[PDB]
Ligand binder design. Structure first.
Ligand code: HEM
Length: 213
């Protein structure tokens, strides 16, 4: 069984749970405020910072290297424009760093430092999602929050070096299938992908509590 297929199978059920999180329902219903959006976006800032720092540490390692697409995928410079937009010039000393965000960053550093062969799980989970449901979330954000088509505030959702997200995703899946793959690596990669989804679910449960409690 191809890694891309194995991953899709392993994560299809938790994906259902992820897209039907309370925070995400509210999001999809058009019920998303400036405050909430700022929270989530700050949290993603720390997360992709960690992910991308670990991608860079392992860019020449053959267990990840074929998935190394900084120009097309990396989100950090984008998230920097977005933080400046949402939090202002001094956003670096403004933005929150929640405990669930930290738990996520911490795992990212463990994977990147000790188990680089799983790093694919974490890039899969985030980047492919961004190129799928992220695109739908983007249109909802624009309508709900009156964000202009020029794109300010939504750099995270914008992939100017990818012309066709669908064909790119196909390319990425195919590449995933060229990684050296043993049963031990395949099993563990698909477990880590599930953990990645859970980390995301936990982040959203925490953001939603913060918006109420
Ligand atoms: C309202 C929220 C969401 C919607 C509407 C949504 C929608 C989608 C749709 C329609 C696809 C299929 C596209 C294709 O086959 O190429 C997809 C794939 C994916 N999504 Fe989501 N999604 C949402 C949230 C999430 C979250 C929170 C994550 C991860 C944290 C995520 C990760 C992925 C991944 C990794 C894939 C690729 C599956 C694969 O083709 O192997 N999605 N999503």
């Amino acid at each position: 069984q191809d890694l891309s297929e194995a991953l899709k199978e392993a994560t299809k059920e938790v994906h259902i749970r992820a897209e039907n999180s309370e925070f995400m329902r509210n999001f999809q219903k058009g019920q998303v405020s400036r405050e909430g959006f700022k929270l989530v976006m700050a949290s993603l800032y720390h997360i992709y910072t960690a992910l991308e720092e670990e991608i860079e540490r392992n860019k020449q390692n053959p267990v990840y290297a074929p998935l190394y697409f900084p120009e097309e995928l990396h989100r950090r410079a984008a998230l920097e424009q977005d933080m400046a937009f949402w939090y202002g010039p001094h956003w670096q000393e403004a933005i929150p760093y929640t405990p669930a965000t930290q738990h996520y960053v911490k795992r990212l550093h463990e994977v990147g430092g000790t188990h680089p062969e799983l790093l694919v799980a974490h890039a899969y989970t985030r980047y492919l999602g961004d190129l799928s449901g992220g695109q739908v979330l983007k249109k909802i954000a624009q309508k709900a929050m009156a964000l202009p088509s020029s794109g300010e505030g939504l750099a995270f959702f914008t992939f100017p070096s990818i012309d066709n997200p669908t064909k790119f995703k196909q390319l990425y899946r195919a590449r995933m299938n060229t990684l050296e793959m043993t049963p031990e690596v395949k099993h563990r990669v698909t477990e880590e992908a599930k953990t990645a989804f859970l980390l995301n679910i936990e982040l959203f449960e925490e953001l939603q509590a913060l918006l109420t409690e």
